């Protein structure tokens, strides 16, 4: 019969849809998992969707995924109360079976599920407490602590008076009665958390607003024969904006940094005033650009902007990357606009930070000395840079740092003799030719 | 103005001993609505 045939693969595919959704259920995937789950006929696969939750819980690979699982149930209980209505039933009997079985591993699996569901208002506080009365009627203490660690936060909010009575009997356990040792230390840890207020039993996937979960708080008691509806998981036979072309927010910020920068006496004062403002990290690249441009209005290099920039870098590492990003942004882009009076300010400015290791020598590797990838004003910037390296460090100490720098831009060694003839001709034009002793040995071998 | 400036205050007991550096700032001139009045030391290029 083709109708039994059609319904069976329909029953199969629904069963083969729910099981990979539950096996892929995780936090930040809950909403996409629930969406796809909604389009499959949940109501026809009523016990199928329940049993796939129960078995994925029980398996003991999970337990970790229990709050992810319980959050889906509250979504389902919000959407269809009957789904959570049936699913809360099976978890009661699974507890009652394994408590009677004394399967301590499987009990705690169910109890973590029942705890979180109470955290997600699926089930009533009543059904929780009576389990607690049964467990505390025997010892059962390994089970009951994992319950109260996760649920006692919400439970003391809702049912404080009876909950306090649970603690008072629980407190009578430790002090006036003798207990096995390993169990006992776990019991007093609960007391410790109790002063600590439960702040590590109160984190999970509260996706649903308290009015977006339709409040089907199922009031079922673990003393109610619960109809154990395994049968619906069998197969059957249904005969059934304004665009911003202006930057006036930036200009009022660009004025405020300039007014800080002119109202100070020393560079340590202007540095503290810029660190007082607590500038956000997207603007700290722009604050360096206001400092450099205001250093070019000065018409002469100043030690003010150096010791300003030194206290920026040693404060936090995000200022140090901001000067590293600006030194590349100045050399590769901004050299074409700058006059030769402004380039002697910058080369002495960047020459000062490099000679005192506020910027590394590896930032000089970006600069390349060729005929092609060189500017006539860029060679002027290199000239005033190396002079501040010579005057501060000396000619021997600068020789040591350039050998440790292993750069290829200033120093071509692998070949291309027209570039070696270029760089010797450029460095001797600066007035520093003692460093070109390596290249002239490389040049005459090529000849 | 030359006095709307944070004045460096650094540990007068130990500032006579060594050069401490600028560790703290004293306020220079006080006003209800905060104005950062510039000072001419930023406008006069130094001798060096």
């Amino acid at each position: 019969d083709e109708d039994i045939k059609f319904q069976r693969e329909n029953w199969e595919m629904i069963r083969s849809h729910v099981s990979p959704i539950i096996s892929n259920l995780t936090m930040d995937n809950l909403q996409e998992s629930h969406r796809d789950l909604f389009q499959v006929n949940i109501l026809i696969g009523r016990n199928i969707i329940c049993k796939n939750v129960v078995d994925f819980t029980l398996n003991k690979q999970n337990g970790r995924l229990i709050p992810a699982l319980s959050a889906l149930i509250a979504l389902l209980n919000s959407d269809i109360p009957d789904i959570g209505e049936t699913l809360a039933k099976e978890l009661m009997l699974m507890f009652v079976q394994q408590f009677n079985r004394k399967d301590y591993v499987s009990c705690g699996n169910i109890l973590q599920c029942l705890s979180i569901l109470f955290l997600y208002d699926v089930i009533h506080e009543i059904v929780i407490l009576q389990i607690l009365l049964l467990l505390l009627e025997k010892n059962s203490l390994r089970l009951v602590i994992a319950v109260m660690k996760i649920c006692g936060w919400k439970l003391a909010l809702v049912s404080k008076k009876t909950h306090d009575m649970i603690w008072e009997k629980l407190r009578y356990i430790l002090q006036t009665q003798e207990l096995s040792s390993t169990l006992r230390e776990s019991l007093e840890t609960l007391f410790e958390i109790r002063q600590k207020d439960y702040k590590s039993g109160s984190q999970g996937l509260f996706i649903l607003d308290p009015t977006s979960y339709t409040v089907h708080t199922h009031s079922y008691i673990v003393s109610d024969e619960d109809e154990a509806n395994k049968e619906l998981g069998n197969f059957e036979k249904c005969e059934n904006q304004i665009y911003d072309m202006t930057s006036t927010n930036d200009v009022e910020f660009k004025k405020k940094i300039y007014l800080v920068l002119k109202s100070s006496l020393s560079g340590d004062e202007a540095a503290h005033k810029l660190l007082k403002l607590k500038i956000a990290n997207n603007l700290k690249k722009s604050v360096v650009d206001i400092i450099i441009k205001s250093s070019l209005q000065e018409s002469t290099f100043s030690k003010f902007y150096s010791i300003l920039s030194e206290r920026m870098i040693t404060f936090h590492r995000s200022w140090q990357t901001a000067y590293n990003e600006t030194f590349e942004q100045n050399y590769t882009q901004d050299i074409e606009d700058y006059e030769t009076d402004q380039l002697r300010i910058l080369g002495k400015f960047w020459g000062h930070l490099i000679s005192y290791e506020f910027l590394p020598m590896d930032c000089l590797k970006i600069i390349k000395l060729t005929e092609e990838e060189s500017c006539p004003q860029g060679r002027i910037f290199i000239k005033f840079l190396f002079q501040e390296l010579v005057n501060e460090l000396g000619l021997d100490e600068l020789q040591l740092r350039l050998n440790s720098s292993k750069l290829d831009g200033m120093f071509p060694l692998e070949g291309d003799a027209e570039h070696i003839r270029y760089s010797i001709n450029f460095f001797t034009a600066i007035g520093l030719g003692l460093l070109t002793e390596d290249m002239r040995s490389r040049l005459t071998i090529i000849q | 103005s030359a006095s709307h400036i944070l004045i460096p205050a650094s540990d007068l007991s130990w500032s006579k001993q060594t050069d401490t550096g600028i560790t703290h700032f004293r306020a220079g001139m006080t006003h209800e609505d905060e104005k950062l009045i510039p000072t001419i030391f930023r406008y006069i290029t130094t001798w060096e």
Partner: peptide, 27 residues
């Protein structure tokens, strides 16, 4: 707190005596 820094008083100083730590001097 008055950890050796600041003024004996702000009466004859013609300032407020407000001391704030230099965020620039750290290391």
């Amino acid at each position: 707190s008055y950890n050796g820094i600041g003024l004996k008083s702000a009466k004859g100083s013609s300032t407020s005596g407000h001391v704030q730590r230099s965020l620039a001097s750290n290391n």
